[PDB]
Amino acid sequence: FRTVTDVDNAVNGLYDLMSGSGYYGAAMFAYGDMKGDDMQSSEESGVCNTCYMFNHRPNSLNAGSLWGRPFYILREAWNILNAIAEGKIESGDEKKLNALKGETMAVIALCQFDLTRCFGYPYTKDKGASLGAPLIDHLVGTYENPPRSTVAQAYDFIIETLEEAVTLMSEEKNNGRMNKYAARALLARIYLYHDDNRKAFDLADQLIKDADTSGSYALYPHEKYVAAWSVEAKFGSESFFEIANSVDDTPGRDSWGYLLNWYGYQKGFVTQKYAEQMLADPGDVRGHLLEENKYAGKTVWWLYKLRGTDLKTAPLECNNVVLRLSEVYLIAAEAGCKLGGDAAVQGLGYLNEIVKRGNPDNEVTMADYTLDRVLDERSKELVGEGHRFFDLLRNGKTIVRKGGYHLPSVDEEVDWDFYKCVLPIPEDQFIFSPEMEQNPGYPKN
Ligand code: NA
């Protein structure tokens, strides 16, 4: 760590780590989609299957690297911050160093947030009273083993970190990494998850306004929506942050794009419920991402959202979207609905923008502007993007996963009282911290 260039390279390495199939290369999406009601596993083995079946245990999480990889990134990220804070970097390029510091803090906030929503019960269950993951809110000592902190403690840190990050970061685009827009989009999400509905609405609203005034981001039009999901259209106008993948880099056959593809590893489908939701409205362009085929003597539909240049060749090089503009519209819509008043009027406007982009013949009237209606819009819009499980559970909903072509023994009702709505703490944590608590319900050998 001698120069600002060294710092830029270190920060770049954080995203290299994040792109692994164990985290944002695949596992995060398997986790968010396969645990909802809109996607399911096929008979194939792997992370889609174990997530769908909530087949997780302390000696085998069966959830990619959703513990190890974010923790590893947090350690490397804090090494960067510490170098900067200790005065290790040469002078002269200070504005950029500050941008890199902010960006590093944004990475830390994302990693800790993911750990919190994977290993702690939803904040909204209990005002964050349950235990989250260990909280990497500092440079960890050589022989220090941080304890578990509460979900509330993690949110306090995550929000403060990201609020500060935003003030330091550049608005310039850097494809494959977060910029100030990405960081604000993530913060609006986190405010929403934290029940800070006014903060979520006000931020989401201003971010949309700023995208419009600058022209720097824009919603895909109805007629261009399917093409916007192509490998030929990377870093599109909605994308604040996506993981950069290529044909020559890992992940290839274990990238989310290859796992979901019928012609790739065929790990999952949309559910009959999602397919029926969409095909009842053929004018909605989001249904054009579904592809019909035949599995175990039934019609099924798979999700062709990570689109290569050839229908019948599964792609190795698809980028995974992490933060895009449509989510921000839905955050404003959800928070506005929860707030009522003027925020509701405005949030309905944003909801309709997404509804009508999907199908211009549709609308949502004020009489129909309910939380369930906004969550149904999220279902439609964000399938395959890792949201559904979290969006239902944080709103205290029961996820119903029954009938259709669901697999035998699927958990048919999942809510925030289900002990496997969080992953277990890995058994090897108890080597150095034997008195650390395991999540309730799980065994402790
Ligand atoms: Na690849």
PDB file of C-alpha atoms and ligand atoms in Angstrom, residues 245-253 255 316-318, ligand 1:
ATOM      1  CA  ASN A 245     -18.158 -11.719 -15.769  1.00  0.00           C
ATOM      2  CA  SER A 246     -16.510 -12.855 -18.986  1.00  0.00           C
ATOM      3  CA  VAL A 247     -16.202 -16.040 -21.027  1.00  0.00           C
ATOM      4  CA  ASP A 248     -12.555 -16.480 -19.873  1.00  0.00           C
ATOM      5  CA  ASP A 249     -13.103 -16.005 -16.151  1.00  0.00           C
ATOM      6  CA  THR A 250     -14.710 -18.010 -13.406  1.00  0.00           C
ATOM      7  CA  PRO A 251     -17.524 -18.507 -12.697  1.00  0.00           C
ATOM      8  CA  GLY A 252     -18.457 -20.314 -15.941  1.00  0.00           C
ATOM      9  CA  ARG A 253     -20.630 -23.392 -15.603  1.00  0.00           C
ATOM     10  CA  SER A 255     -22.339 -18.901 -12.764  1.00  0.00           C
ATOM     11  CA  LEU A 316     -20.699 -18.661 -19.378  1.00  0.00           C
ATOM     12  CA  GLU A 317     -20.293 -14.875 -19.270  1.00  0.00           C
ATOM     13  CA  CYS A 318     -23.512 -13.352 -17.866  1.00  0.00           C
TER      14      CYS A 318
HETATM   15 NA    NA B   1     -17.456 -16.596 -16.856  1.00  0.00          NA
END
